[PDB]
Every structure is written in C-alpha cells, then in structure tokens.
Amino acid sequence: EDAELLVTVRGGRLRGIRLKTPGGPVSAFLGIPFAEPPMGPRRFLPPEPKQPWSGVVDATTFQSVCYQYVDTLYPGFEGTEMWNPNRELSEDCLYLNVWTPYPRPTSPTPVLVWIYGGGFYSGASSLDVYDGRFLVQAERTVLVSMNYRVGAFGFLALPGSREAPGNVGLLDQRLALQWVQENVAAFGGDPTSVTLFGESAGAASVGMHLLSPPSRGLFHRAVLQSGAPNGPWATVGMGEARRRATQLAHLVGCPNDTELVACLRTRPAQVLVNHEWHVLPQESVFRFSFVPVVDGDFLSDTPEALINAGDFHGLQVLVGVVKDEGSYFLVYGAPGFSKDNESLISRAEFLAGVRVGVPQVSDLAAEAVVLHYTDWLHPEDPARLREALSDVVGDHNVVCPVAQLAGRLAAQGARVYAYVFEHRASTLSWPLWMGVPHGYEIEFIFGIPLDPSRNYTAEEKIFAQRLMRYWANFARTGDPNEPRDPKAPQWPPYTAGAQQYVSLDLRPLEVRRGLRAQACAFWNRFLPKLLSA
Amino acid sequence: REDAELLVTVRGGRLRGIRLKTPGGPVSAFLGIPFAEPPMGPRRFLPPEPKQPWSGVVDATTFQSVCYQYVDTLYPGFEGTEMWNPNRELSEDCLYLNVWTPYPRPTSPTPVLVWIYGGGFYSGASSLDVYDGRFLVQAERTVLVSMNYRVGAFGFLALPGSREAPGNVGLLDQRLALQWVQENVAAFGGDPTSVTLFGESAGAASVGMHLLSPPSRGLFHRAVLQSGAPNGPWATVGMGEARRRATQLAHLVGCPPTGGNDTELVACLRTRPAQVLVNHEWHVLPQESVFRFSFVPVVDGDFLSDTPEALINAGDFHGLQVLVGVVKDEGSYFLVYGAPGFSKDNESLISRAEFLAGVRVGVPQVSDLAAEAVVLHYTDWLHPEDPARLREALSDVVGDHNVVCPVAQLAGRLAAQGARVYAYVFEHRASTLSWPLWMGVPHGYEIEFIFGIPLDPSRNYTAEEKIFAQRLMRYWANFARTGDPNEPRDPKAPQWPPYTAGAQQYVSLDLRPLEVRRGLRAQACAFWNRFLPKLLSA
Ligand SMILES: *[C@@H]1O[C@H](CO[C@@H]2O[C@@H](C)[C@@H](O)[C@@H](O)[C@@H]2O)[C@@H](O[C@@H]2O[C@H](CO)[C@@H](O)[C@H](O)[C@H]2NC(C)=O)[C@H](O)[C@H]1NC(C)=O
Ligand SMILES: *[C@@H]1O[C@H](CO[C@@H]2O[C@@H](C)[C@@H](O)[C@@H](O)[C@@H]2O)[C@@H](O[C@@H]2O[C@H](CO)[C@@H](O)[C@H](O)[C@H]2NC(C)=O)[C@H](O)[C@H]1NC(C)=O
Ligand SMILES: *[C@@H]1O[C@H](CO)[C@@H](O)[C@H](O)[C@H]1NC(C)=O
Structure with a gap:
C-alpha cells in the first residue's frame, strides 16, 4: 500500500493516485468534495462546507462538470472541443483537485490555485489543458484547481432575495480558497504562500477576489491572464x-x-x-x-x-x-x-x-469606434478590415481592461509584471489568419508540450519550461525573473508611465512599451466620457 | 505727349496707367481703378453702388487706400508681421481694383487671374508687396486683377433682415469687382470667358463662397483655394x-x-x-x-x-x-x-x-x-508630456481644424460631385523666412512664390528659389489657361494627377520635382470631418 497517496483532511480521509510525467512521478488527488452538493433546495444558494465523511473518499479521478452549454459550432474540431465538458454534467460538481510532488513535500511548498475561464457560462478543472502534473513536477509547487458553478447555477441573481442572492459561483471559488487555507498543509502546501492564477473569466474572478476583502486574506499574489474584473462582460x-x-x-x-x-x-x-x-x-x-x-x-x-x-x-x-x-x-x-x-x-x-x-x-x-479603427487611406480593404475588427473586439473586451487594471494597480502601489504572448503553437488547429488566439498560452503555462504523446517541437518544450519557470518564480517571490540570473535579459515591472512589458515567444524576452496604448486611450479615457454626456 | 499703351477706356470713362519695369521686361499697370462709389457716410454698411461714369482721364497710377482695419502690433518692426500690415493710409474710401497686363497690350483675348486677399475678413489689402502682379503677368502673359473689399465691421457687420446693415457687403464688393472684370477686362486684352479666381485663407474662403452663390458663379470659370475654404469654422x-x-x-x-x-x-x-x-x-x-x-x-x-x-x-x-x-x-x-x-x-x-x-x-x-475628443486624438499616449511633441500636436490641431480638413472636405466633395480637382502641399521654407525654424513652412508663405516675388532683384532669394517660383507661376497659369496645371505637351516632366475622394492624390511643391502622395491628413481629417459633427448632434 502506498502511504504517499493517503491523506487526511479536516472532513476525513482521501486516496490519491500516482501520475507519470516525462520528468518523473507526481501525486494527484482529484475529485475532492469541498462543498455539500448544491442541489434541489440548494440550487442558487451559497455553497455549504462539505460535512465530514467516514471511510475513504476515492480521489483518483476527475469529478463531474458543472452544468453548462456545450459548444457545437464546429463538432469534432479540436479547437472548440478542447474547451467542452470532458466528464458528465451534474449539479453535484463542487470538487477540487490537488497535485503535489512525489513523494509529498515534507516542508511548506508554494501553492498555485487555478481558476478556469469560460465566460462564467462554461469551463471545468478537468480539461486536459489544465492538467497540473507538469507544473508540479517541473517547478515543485503544489497546484490546486476547483470547479465552480457557472451560468444560471452560479450567477442567476434576484438582488435582495435570500433564495438567489447572486455571485454564488464566486463564493464556490472562495470556499475552495478557504479549503486550501485549512487543508493544503496536509499535502505539503504552504497556506502562507498562495498564488491565484486564471484566464479570461478566470482572470476576472482572480481580480474580483483582489477587490473583495473576505477573499483577500486567502491568497498572497495574483496572475491575470487575458481577463480583468473591469472587462465590460465581467x-x-x-x-x-x-x-x-x-x-x-x-x-x-x-x-x-x-x-x-x-x-x-x-x-x-x-x-x-x-x-x-x-x-x-x-x-x-x-x-x-x-x-x-x-x-x-x-x-x-x-x-x-x-x-x-x-x-x-x-x-x-x-x-x-x-x-x-x-x-x-x-x-x-x-x-x-x-x-x-x-x-x-x-x-x-x-x-x-x-x-x-x-x-x-x-x-x-x-461611430467613434469605426472612426478610430478605420484606415482612411484604405477604408475598404478586406484583410485590413478583418484585422481591425479583431482589434476592436480584443481591445474592448480584453486588452484595454487589462491595461487599465495594470496601470491603476501600478500607480497605487502594486508591483506589476506584464506580458504579451506571441507564439503560435506548431500544433494549432485554428487557421493562420487568427494568429495567436485567446486561450492558447494556457497549454504552454501548464507545460502541456512536455507530454510526449503530443507533437510540439523541441523548441516549444524549452519555451514551455521557460514559461513554467517565470510563473513559478512569480509564485515563490513575486518576481518572475530568474532570481539570480545575471546575463538573462530582465523582465522589468510595468508602470503607468513607461508601460513596459515583455514579449513571450521562442526568442529571448524583448522589452516593449504600451499595451495598445493609443487604442486603449480610446476605450479607457474617451468612451466613458461619451456614454456620460 | 502721351503713350497709347497706357490709355484705356472702360465703361465708366477713360484711364491712364503706368509702365512697370520687371526683370523680364515691361508690364502695363492700372492701379487704383474705382469700381464702386465710396462707401462713405450714409453708405457705410451698405452694398456697393457701381462707380458712376466720369469725364476726363482717371490716373490709375498707384495703389489706393487700404480699407479700415486693425493693425497688428504683436511684433513691431518684425517683417513677418509688417508684411501683412497696411502699406497705404486707411480710408473708408477704398473700393479700388488693379489690372496688370502685358506691354504691349495682348492682341488676342488673354486668360485672366483674379486675386482675392486673405486676412481673416478683418484685414488685408491688394496693395501688399507680396501680391504684386507684375511678375506673373510678365512671366506667363496673363491678365492679373486684384480688388480691395471692405473688411471688419465695414464689410461684414450684419443686422440680418435690415436694409441698413444686411451683412456680407465685403463679398458684394468682391462680386462687383468680378462684374467689372466681365464688362471691362477685354479693354485691357483680357478674356472675360476665361477668368480664374484665386485667393489665400479668407480669400480662399471668399473664392469658395463665390462658387456657392449662383449670382457670382456666372462671373468666372475656375478657382484656386490656397489654405482656406468656405466651410472653415472661422469663415x-x-x-x-x-x-x-x-x-x-x-x-x-x-x-x-x-x-x-x-x-x-x-x-x-x-x-x-x-x-x-x-x-x-x-x-x-x-x-x-x-x-x-x-x-x-x-x-x-x-x-x-x-x-x-x-x-x-x-x-x-x-x-x-x-x-x-x-x-x-x-x-x-x-x-x-x-x-x-x-x-x-x-x-x-x-x-x-x-x-x-x-x-x-x-x-x-x-x-x-x-x-476631450481632440486631446484624445492628438495625444501620443506613449509620450503624453513631451514638450516638443505637444508643440507639434497643438500646431496640427489648429491647422487641421481651421485649414487642412476644411480644404480636404471641400476637395473630396467637389471631386465626387463632378469637378476636376488638383491638390498640393507647399513644403518649401523660404531662405528669406524671418519666423523661427520650429514654425516650419507657415500659413501664407507660399504666396510670395506664386506671385514670383523671388524674381524681384532687390530681394535676396537663391537662384533655385527663382527657378521654383517660375515653376509655380507656370502651374497656376497653366491651370488658369487650361483647367489643368500640367505642362501641355511636356511628357518627361513628372505629372500632377487629379485629386479624387478615393485615391486622394496630391503633390508636394518644393525644390525637388513633384512627388505624388496620398491623403490630406486623412486620419486626422476623418476625425474633424466625419466624427466630430455627429458628436454635435448628440
Ligand atoms: C467564409 O465563410 C463564411 C461563413 O459561411 C459558412 O462557412 C463557409 C466556409 C461555407 O461552408 C459556407 O457555405 C457557410 O455558410 C461566409 O459567410 C456566409 O456567406 C453566405 C453567403 O450567402 C451567407 O449565406 C452566410 O450567412 C454567411 N455566414 C456568416 C456567418 O456571415 C463567407 O461568405 C465566406 N467568405 C468567402 C466565401 O469569401
Ligand atoms: C517663451 O515665450 C513666451 C512668451 O513670453 C515673451 O517672450 C519670451 C521670448 C521672453 O522674452 C519673455 O520674457 C516674454 O514675456 C513665454 O510665456 C510667457 O511667460 C511669462 C513669464 O513666465 C508670462 O508672464 C507670460 O504671460 C507668458 N506668455 C504667454 C503667452 O504664455 C514662455 O514662458 C517662454 N518659454 C520659455 C522662456 O521657456
Ligand atoms: C425705425 O425708425 C424709422 C425712423 O423713423 C422708421 O421709418 C420706422 O418706424 C422704424 N423701422 C421699422 C422697420 O420699424
């Protein structure tokens, strides 16, 4: 019997599973219940802590996906199916997962907590692209991810009512963070070093925990990938x-x-x-x-x-x-x-x-949008119009809200690091005109290219290892820079003035200025004044 | 006794002019021809009355008075400002025009250029040195006419509806002078069927207003608008x-x-x-x-x-x-x-x-x-406080809003609605320019080249500038003659293509050969011409 896979948390006993990676084994505890099933009379209600159980909870496989729409735009296409539920749907879905080194750390290890995106209407912690095994083996962190309710189940609100107060999906996430405070040490994790990271609605969620005092004592650092709580959709x-x-x-x-x-x-x-x-x-x-x-x-x-x-x-x-x-x-x-x-x-x-x-x-x-995004020397060129509308949509919903968050936080005391991810995966299934689309840095952050069964290049694997190091350095110290690496080109902090960020691609870091500064002045400075008067 | 070339009879009576020396040879000038009754006393603020016929000979031998106007004192004694100030005494008795014609008088009808000065409708005069028509007339053998018109309150104070100060009488001054040209320019050898108006700033805006007023539109055939448009916000x-x-x-x-x-x-x-x-x-x-x-x-x-x-x-x-x-x-x-x-x-x-x-x-x-929208568009948000860039941007703001974008809009609409349009940007900084270097090529400083002023021996332009001056005079007079500035029958010369709403082509005028470029501050002017008026409505 393998003791490394047996853990006792406050609610009771758990049995994990040993996973393989090209770099060696990892321990995983998948499908840990952290709330009472939010079903029947508990639909739309705040999560209740999971009551203690007797015996041993089987935590060897991912649990159910919270109810959500299944995308059928391109049935069977990898680019859309990789985001769809890969377990059966259920309202009984409030489970979380822990990956830890093997054997389990015996001294406090920094914790990364992943919150998935999906527009608050979809997502799951069980998607292949969020597999924590490579990060944990390579960088020796503990990694936690939770399911939270989405769609009406997570965010239907009749404000003022007790029966559907709203934001219970966010409370699902908070309850999981409380769970991490109370239980992560049993896995070798350090509850005093917890870094939240999330992408899109996941990033917006991270931002919301930043801005909500009862969440703020549950973590120490934050990563916001392609999303912000001030996004117009959030x-x-x-x-x-x-x-x-x-x-x-x-x-x-x-x-x-x-x-x-x-x-x-x-x-x-x-x-x-x-x-x-x-x-x-x-x-x-x-x-x-x-x-x-x-x-x-x-x-x-x-x-x-x-x-x-x-x-x-x-x-x-x-x-x-x-x-x-x-x-x-x-x-x-x-x-x-x-x-x-x-x-x-x-x-x-x-x-x-x-x-x-x-x-x-x-x-x-x-009209103001069309003004600013038309090239009036080529107002009807189809390729330029395609690119411009891409710019419009990305600027409005992602880039400028992130730039605004970055600038305000930096000017008000935060230390901020900013990146633009510019590598198009050799394996990408979307057409060339889409460039580096939304969501496609995640597989690199999670080190998915190390998986031998997939087809990334040797250069892509080294790149993934770089990104995993940046992210884990940040989680350990608040600074992604290779702590002491003299002759590596340095990632400077982002500031409201100099607005420096780095490009993440197969080349060494390149420092640049401005997250679409001209375009984001439009969305962040002018347009609000307009919608007023 | 008398020189027949210097004598002309016009509908009102007889005139005596003067023979002018130019570097290229003699020109006849009839300066200070009365074309209206003096708008004095009871006639202040009223439309101009045509000049009554006279007996005897009127000496049209020097510029008459400047219409009353404010005199600029910002930089006293400085050439850059004094070159625009009155160089004759001020009087309400100022409705006179000038004709320059080749010596001897043309024997077949000759294309007429008619100049309208700028000065914001509050200043200006046809007697300024820089508007001297003798060089154009000598070099290109056109007839050149310029008129004084009332400025300031005297020309444009309006109590709309009243008969005593109806407004726009300065424009009526210009129109009366244009009627005078129709009736009388043939007597100087000019062709009333080929009259080209040209003007700079408020003069360009006046030219445009004559385009858009049917009783003026009959009195000329072609138009040149230099740095101004009737749709200008100041106009x-x-x-x-x-x-x-x-x-x-x-x-x-x-x-x-x-x-x-x-x-x-x-x-x-x-x-x-x-x-x-x-x-x-x-x-x-x-x-x-x-x-x-x-x-x-x-x-x-x-x-x-x-x-x-x-x-x-x-x-x-x-x-x-x-x-x-x-x-x-x-x-x-x-x-x-x-x-x-x-x-x-x-x-x-x-x-x-x-x-x-x-x-x-x-x-x-x-x-x-x-x-706010203006500050947004004109701030470089990677350098929001760089003084040099801010200076440049403010200069672009003022220029775009008041001159370039109104001209671009006029140009695009005329082209799209049937006119043949030619557009330029004047990019040469005069070797003689007395304004500082940061001002670049300022408003008004193409005029001296168009009138051929560098050919004046008393001035100190370079030889290349004299050649450049001759090129511009040629384009303008080609345009006056044919409606097309390009050298008729010259092929190895770079060609000036028409301006159209789509390709938006124009040429740069400087010491180098014509370079064809696209768009008159097109991104900037989309802001002024397309968006900003929609913001007025909401
Ligand atoms: C590019 O494709 C779009 C999408 O149309 C679908 O996908 C195509 C690849 C092909 O399978 C089509 O038959 C599909 O309808 C085209 O936009 C469509 O244009 C048709 C024209 O009649 C119209 O009926 C649809 O509503 C359009 N769809 C959308 C979403 O607007 C587009 O025309 C294609 N580009 C080309 C052909 O240059
Ligand atoms: C640049 O000049 C302006 C204009 O001021 C005048 O011209 C200067 C060349 C110099 O001779 C000054 O002494 C003149 O007063 C300056 O703006 C003025 O600054 C003074 C004092 O700071 C102020 O009282 C005036 O109101 C200002 N006038 C305007 C129109 O703003 C400007 O500060 C100069 N820049 C420098 C010197 O760096
Ligand atoms: C203004 O006064 C004049 C002067 O007597 C007179 O003719 C008239 O009553 C007034 N004009 C108008 C239009 O009422």
Missing part, C-alpha cells in the same frame, strides 16, 4: 441581473422572488442551460447571460470604482494578453467570418461586426 | 450670432444711447469715426481665440442660401476645375498670437497644461466633450 448591475433572471423564468414557464426561484428549482438543469443564451438584450459574439453582479456585498462597488480607490502596496501581480485576443471570438457570430476561409470581410460586414463585438453602446459610441 | 457665422456681435459693438461705442430699431442703431453706428469701430471690434468675440475674427460672412439665405457645408454637399460641380492646397505647417503661425507658452522668440516647448489650454483657444466654441 459584471452586471442589480437591475439588469433581475431582468435576466426574470426573463429566464418566463422562458422556462415559471412566473414574488420566492415563488419565482421555487419554480426555477423544479426545472431540470438542462432546461435552464437550453434557454440561458436568449436572455441577452442584444446579439453578441459573446454568450454571457449570467455573470457576477455588483450588489454591495461581494463587490461593494464596481470593479472600476474599487480599483481606483484601492491601496495596492504589498501586492504583486502578473498580467498579460495573447497577440490576437479578438480573433477567436469573431467566428461565433461576426458576419463573414469562418475558421474555414480567410474571412476577408466587406466594409458593411465590418460595420455589422462592430455592433456585435461591442454590444450595448450607443450609435454615437459605435 | 461664416449664423444670423443670430452676427446680430449679437453687431449689437455688442454698437453697445460698446455708445449705440444706441442695446438693440432696438435697426435703422436707428445703424444711424448711430454711422456717426462713429471709423477708427473707433476698429478699436472696439476685438471686444465682440464670444470666446478668447487665436482667430480674432469678429465680423465674417453671415449665412442668411441671401448670398449663401445655406451653410457652405450644406451647399457643397448638395451641389453639382460638373464643368468646374479647381486647384486647392495648404502649406506644410498651417497651425504654427496662429499659435504665437495667443496660445499659452508660444513665442516666435523661443522654442515654444509647452507643458501638457499649456497644450490642454491651447486646444480651447485654437478650437474655440466646441463643448468639453469635443475638446
């Missing part, structure tokens, strides 16, 4: 949240908040999933119906307000974007776009694309 | 704002002893000494500005049936040829006239707060939101 106001909840109810044949939630609770989960898409007020390339609500509780103000008011001395943050944030999203509803052709769009398609990529702004606002 | 005013300005001027000079009967008010304005009106005209502007233009053409349904912007958009311009352009640094000259931090005598390396303040004075009368 939150919703109380009034609009109530409207969307009410629309969902009507669409599933339900009619007083108590009566409305009770009716919603009688519906099969799959039925809520089936209707969640058409509660949105405007058509969009984004499928984001239920998201965190600003209601004074989890978030006492908008993330923008909270960010401007905040004292961030003592914080270190690693943030960045991929080279082409907008391109991936354009095939989910921008007219003229497909992964299977060149998507050379016309100016009419461009104008249409703008209304879909930048939903819910005024005509005046949209 | 017209609405009826109510014109009346407000007129009324405030009246008030400030004690009339009446505000508003009331227009007849009474104007009668009281007519008793004030000219100089008193001039001394107070700076007071009537609603905002502090670097374009101190108190009285300007008024959009009132008469001379202009609609805004020039609207008239441009709605117009059929088939059969028209037009030549338009700008200098390289349109904005710099205006900044030393009041933008905080600026001086011709230092480098004008301004702060960000000075830049922000400059935007308000260089783009007056726009909302805070609009000013």
Whole structure:
C-alpha cells in the first residue's frame, strides 16, 4: 500500500493516485468534495462546507462538470472541443483537485490555485489543458484547481432575495480558497504562500477576489491572464441581473422572488442551460447571460470604482494578453467570418461586426469606434478590415481592461509584471489568419508540450519550461525573473508611465512599451466620457 | 505727349496707367481703378453702388487706400508681421481694383487671374508687396486683377433682415469687382470667358463662397483655394450670432444711447469715426481665440442660401476645375498670437497644461466633450508630456481644424460631385523666412512664390528659389489657361494627377520635382470631418 497517496483532511480521509510525467512521478488527488452538493433546495444558494465523511473518499479521478452549454459550432474540431465538458454534467460538481510532488513535500511548498475561464457560462478543472502534473513536477509547487458553478447555477441573481442572492459561483471559488487555507498543509502546501492564477473569466474572478476583502486574506499574489474584473462582460448591475433572471423564468414557464426561484428549482438543469443564451438584450459574439453582479456585498462597488480607490502596496501581480485576443471570438457570430476561409470581410460586414463585438453602446459610441479603427487611406480593404475588427473586439473586451487594471494597480502601489504572448503553437488547429488566439498560452503555462504523446517541437518544450519557470518564480517571490540570473535579459515591472512589458515567444524576452496604448486611450479615457454626456 | 499703351477706356470713362519695369521686361499697370462709389457716410454698411461714369482721364497710377482695419502690433518692426500690415493710409474710401497686363497690350483675348486677399475678413489689402502682379503677368502673359473689399465691421457687420446693415457687403464688393472684370477686362486684352479666381485663407474662403452663390458663379470659370475654404469654422457665422456681435459693438461705442430699431442703431453706428469701430471690434468675440475674427460672412439665405457645408454637399460641380492646397505647417503661425507658452522668440516647448489650454483657444466654441475628443486624438499616449511633441500636436490641431480638413472636405466633395480637382502641399521654407525654424513652412508663405516675388532683384532669394517660383507661376497659369496645371505637351516632366475622394492624390511643391502622395491628413481629417459633427448632434 502506498502511504504517499493517503491523506487526511479536516472532513476525513482521501486516496490519491500516482501520475507519470516525462520528468518523473507526481501525486494527484482529484475529485475532492469541498462543498455539500448544491442541489434541489440548494440550487442558487451559497455553497455549504462539505460535512465530514467516514471511510475513504476515492480521489483518483476527475469529478463531474458543472452544468453548462456545450459548444457545437464546429463538432469534432479540436479547437472548440478542447474547451467542452470532458466528464458528465451534474449539479453535484463542487470538487477540487490537488497535485503535489512525489513523494509529498515534507516542508511548506508554494501553492498555485487555478481558476478556469469560460465566460462564467462554461469551463471545468478537468480539461486536459489544465492538467497540473507538469507544473508540479517541473517547478515543485503544489497546484490546486476547483470547479465552480457557472451560468444560471452560479450567477442567476434576484438582488435582495435570500433564495438567489447572486455571485454564488464566486463564493464556490472562495470556499475552495478557504479549503486550501485549512487543508493544503496536509499535502505539503504552504497556506502562507498562495498564488491565484486564471484566464479570461478566470482572470476576472482572480481580480474580483483582489477587490473583495473576505477573499483577500486567502491568497498572497495574483496572475491575470487575458481577463480583468473591469472587462465590460465581467459584471452586471442589480437591475439588469433581475431582468435576466426574470426573463429566464418566463422562458422556462415559471412566473414574488420566492415563488419565482421555487419554480426555477423544479426545472431540470438542462432546461435552464437550453434557454440561458436568449436572455441577452442584444446579439453578441459573446454568450454571457449570467455573470457576477455588483450588489454591495461581494463587490461593494464596481470593479472600476474599487480599483481606483484601492491601496495596492504589498501586492504583486502578473498580467498579460495573447497577440490576437479578438480573433477567436469573431467566428461565433461576426458576419463573414469562418475558421474555414480567410474571412476577408466587406466594409458593411465590418460595420455589422462592430455592433456585435461591442454590444450595448450607443450609435454615437459605435461611430467613434469605426472612426478610430478605420484606415482612411484604405477604408475598404478586406484583410485590413478583418484585422481591425479583431482589434476592436480584443481591445474592448480584453486588452484595454487589462491595461487599465495594470496601470491603476501600478500607480497605487502594486508591483506589476506584464506580458504579451506571441507564439503560435506548431500544433494549432485554428487557421493562420487568427494568429495567436485567446486561450492558447494556457497549454504552454501548464507545460502541456512536455507530454510526449503530443507533437510540439523541441523548441516549444524549452519555451514551455521557460514559461513554467517565470510563473513559478512569480509564485515563490513575486518576481518572475530568474532570481539570480545575471546575463538573462530582465523582465522589468510595468508602470503607468513607461508601460513596459515583455514579449513571450521562442526568442529571448524583448522589452516593449504600451499595451495598445493609443487604442486603449480610446476605450479607457474617451468612451466613458461619451456614454456620460 | 502721351503713350497709347497706357490709355484705356472702360465703361465708366477713360484711364491712364503706368509702365512697370520687371526683370523680364515691361508690364502695363492700372492701379487704383474705382469700381464702386465710396462707401462713405450714409453708405457705410451698405452694398456697393457701381462707380458712376466720369469725364476726363482717371490716373490709375498707384495703389489706393487700404480699407479700415486693425493693425497688428504683436511684433513691431518684425517683417513677418509688417508684411501683412497696411502699406497705404486707411480710408473708408477704398473700393479700388488693379489690372496688370502685358506691354504691349495682348492682341488676342488673354486668360485672366483674379486675386482675392486673405486676412481673416478683418484685414488685408491688394496693395501688399507680396501680391504684386507684375511678375506673373510678365512671366506667363496673363491678365492679373486684384480688388480691395471692405473688411471688419465695414464689410461684414450684419443686422440680418435690415436694409441698413444686411451683412456680407465685403463679398458684394468682391462680386462687383468680378462684374467689372466681365464688362471691362477685354479693354485691357483680357478674356472675360476665361477668368480664374484665386485667393489665400479668407480669400480662399471668399473664392469658395463665390462658387456657392449662383449670382457670382456666372462671373468666372475656375478657382484656386490656397489654405482656406468656405466651410472653415472661422469663415461664416449664423444670423443670430452676427446680430449679437453687431449689437455688442454698437453697445460698446455708445449705440444706441442695446438693440432696438435697426435703422436707428445703424444711424448711430454711422456717426462713429471709423477708427473707433476698429478699436472696439476685438471686444465682440464670444470666446478668447487665436482667430480674432469678429465680423465674417453671415449665412442668411441671401448670398449663401445655406451653410457652405450644406451647399457643397448638395451641389453639382460638373464643368468646374479647381486647384486647392495648404502649406506644410498651417497651425504654427496662429499659435504665437495667443496660445499659452508660444513665442516666435523661443522654442515654444509647452507643458501638457499649456497644450490642454491651447486646444480651447485654437478650437474655440466646441463643448468639453469635443475638446476631450481632440486631446484624445492628438495625444501620443506613449509620450503624453513631451514638450516638443505637444508643440507639434497643438500646431496640427489648429491647422487641421481651421485649414487642412476644411480644404480636404471641400476637395473630396467637389471631386465626387463632378469637378476636376488638383491638390498640393507647399513644403518649401523660404531662405528669406524671418519666423523661427520650429514654425516650419507657415500659413501664407507660399504666396510670395506664386506671385514670383523671388524674381524681384532687390530681394535676396537663391537662384533655385527663382527657378521654383517660375515653376509655380507656370502651374497656376497653366491651370488658369487650361483647367489643368500640367505642362501641355511636356511628357518627361513628372505629372500632377487629379485629386479624387478615393485615391486622394496630391503633390508636394518644393525644390525637388513633384512627388505624388496620398491623403490630406486623412486620419486626422476623418476625425474633424466625419466624427466630430455627429458628436454635435448628440
Ligand atoms: C467564409 O465563410 C463564411 C461563413 O459561411 C459558412 O462557412 C463557409 C466556409 C461555407 O461552408 C459556407 O457555405 C457557410 O455558410 C461566409 O459567410 C456566409 O456567406 C453566405 C453567403 O450567402 C451567407 O449565406 C452566410 O450567412 C454567411 N455566414 C456568416 C456567418 O456571415 C463567407 O461568405 C465566406 N467568405 C468567402 C466565401 O469569401
Ligand atoms: C517663451 O515665450 C513666451 C512668451 O513670453 C515673451 O517672450 C519670451 C521670448 C521672453 O522674452 C519673455 O520674457 C516674454 O514675456 C513665454 O510665456 C510667457 O511667460 C511669462 C513669464 O513666465 C508670462 O508672464 C507670460 O504671460 C507668458 N506668455 C504667454 C503667452 O504664455 C514662455 O514662458 C517662454 N518659454 C520659455 C522662456 O521657456
Ligand atoms: C425705425 O425708425 C424709422 C425712423 O423713423 C422708421 O421709418 C420706422 O418706424 C422704424 N423701422 C421699422 C422697420 O420699424
């Protein structure tokens, strides 16, 4: 019998599994329950801590995926299927996973906690691309990831009601972080060194824990990959949240908040999933119906307000974007776009694309967008229009919110490191015109190219090892730089003035200035003034 | 006794002129021909009355008086400013025009160039040295005409609806002179069927207004707009704002002893000494500005049936040829006239707060939101506080808003709606230029080359500049003759392509051969011409 795979946590006993990597074994405890199953009367409610169990919980395999829509845009295509549920769906989905070195560390090891993205309507900690075994073996960290409720189950809100208060998916994440404080030492993890990292909605989540005092004592450093809590898709106001909840109810044949939630609770989960898409007020390339609500509780103000008011001395943050944030999203509803052709769009398609990529702004606002993103020496060139609409979508939803977060945090005491990830994977299944799309740095951060069964180049493996080192250096010390490595070119901090970041690719680090500074001045400085007056 | 070449009879009577020496040979000049009754006394603010016929011979032998105007004193004695100041005495008795013609008089009808000076509708004169028509006439054998027209309150004070100060009488001065050319230019050997207007700044805006006013449009055939457009934001005013300005001027000079009967008010304005009106005209502007233009053409349904912007958009311009352009640094000259931090005598390396303040004075009368948009577009957000860059950007702001983008818009619409259009950017800095080097090629400093002033032996231009001057005179007179500036039958010479709304091609005018380029500040002017007006509506 293997004692390394037996662990006792506060709730009871667990049996793990030994995993192989090209670099040696790793211990994994997959499918650890951290909440009571949020089912029946507990749907829409805050998570309750998992009650103690007798006997030994089997933690040798990933547990169920939280209920969510399954993307069928390109059935069987790797580029979309790699994000889809790879376990059965269930509301009984509140489990987390721990990877640790083998044999288990006997002194406190830094902890990385992964929060997946997926627009708050999808995702799972069990996706292959979030496999913690390579990071843990290579960099000797403990790695934790949790499932949290998404869609209506995580973020349906009737603000003010006890029956559906909203943000319970974020509370799922917080409960997992509390679980890590209480239990990670039993795995050799150090609860006093916890680094949160997340991508997209995962990054927005990390940002929200930064801005919510009860979460802030549960970790020490933060990594935000291609997402920010101040992204225009990441939150919703109380009034609009109530409207969307009410629309969902009507669409599933339900009619007083108590009566409305009770009716919603009688519906099969799959039925809520089936209707969640058409509660949105405007058509969009984004499928984001239920998201965190600003209601004074989890978030006492908008993330923008909270960010401007905040004292961030003592914080270190690693943030960045991929080279082409907008391109991936354009095939989910921008007219003229497909992964299977060149998507050379016309100016009419461009104008249409703008209304879909930048939903819910005024005509005046949209005009200003078309102004700033047209090359007036080539206003109708299809390739330039394709690139420009990609820019519009990426700038608005990802790059400029991250740049704004970076600048404010740095000016208010945080130490910030910024990157742009610029390597197109040799294995990438999306067409060449999409460049380095959203989501495709993750496989490199998690060291997936080390997996011999996959087909990355030797150069790509060394690159992955570099990225894993940057990330783990940051988790250990707040600084990704090779602690003492004199003659390696250094990653300087990002500042509101000099705005320096590094390019992450197969070449040595190159320092540059400005995260699309000209474009983000538009989104971050001018457009808010417009939507006012 | 008398020289027959210097004698001409026009509809009003007989004229005697003068034989002018030029480096290339003699020219006949008839300077100071009266074309209207003096707009004196009861005739102040009224439309011009045609000059009554006279017996005997009028000596048209020297420039007549400059129309009353403010005299610039910012840099006293400095050439860069004094070259624009009156060089004859001020008088309300100023409605005279000038004809230059080859010596001997042409024997077959000759293309006529008609010059309209700039000066913001508050200043200027046809007698300035830099507008001397003798070099063009000698070198290109055209007939050249220029006129004085009333400026300031005397030409553009308007109490819309009133018969006593209807407004736009300065433009009517120009029109009357154009009618005079139709009726009389043949007597000098000029061709009334080939008349090309040209003008710079307010003169270019006047040229454009004649394009857009049907009773003027019949009096000429082609047009040249140098650094100005009728759709310029400084170039017209609405009826109510014109009346407000007129009324405030009246008030400030004690009339009446505000508003009331227009007849009474104007009668009281007519008793004030000219100089008193001039001394107070700076007071009537609603905002502090670097374009101190108190009285300007008024959009009132008469001379202009609609805004020039609207008239441009709605117009059929088939059969028209037009030549338009700008200098390289349109904005710099205006900044030393009041933008905080600026001086011709230092480098004008301004702060960000000075830049922000400059935007308000260089783009007056726009909302805070609009000013924000301007700061956004013109800040380099990787270098938001670099003084040199801020100086350059403010110069671009002022130039783009007031000159380049109105010209680009005029050019694109005319081209798209039937006109043949040629566009240039003037990029040569005169070896003789007295403004500092940071100003680059400032507003107004192409004019001396177009008029061939470097050929004046008393001046000290380089030989290359004399050659350059001759090239420009050739383009302008080619255009006047044929509607096309290109050398008819010359092929190894670089060609000047027409400007169109799509390709937006123009040429650079400098010591080097023509270089063809694309877009008149196209990214910048998309902001001024396409977006910013939409922000006005919302
Ligand atoms: C590029 O493809 C898009 C998407 O169309 C689909 O994908 C193609 C690869 C092909 O399989 C098509 O048959 C599919 O319909 C094209 O945009 C479509 O254009 C057609 C034209 O009639 C229109 O009916 C669809 O609604 C369009 N789809 C969207 C999402 O707008 C686009 O025309 C292609 N580009 C080309 C052909 O140059
Ligand atoms: C650049 O010059 C301006 C203009 O000031 C005048 O011209 C200068 C060349 C020099 O002779 C000054 O003494 C003159 O007053 C300067 O702006 C002025 O600054 C003074 C004092 O700081 C102030 O009282 C005025 O109001 C300013 N005028 C304007 C229009 O802003 C400017 O500071 C000079 N820059 C330098 C010297 O670096
Ligand atoms: C202004 O006063 C004049 C002067 O007597 C007179 O003709 C008339 O009543 C007034 N004009 C108008 C238009 O009312």
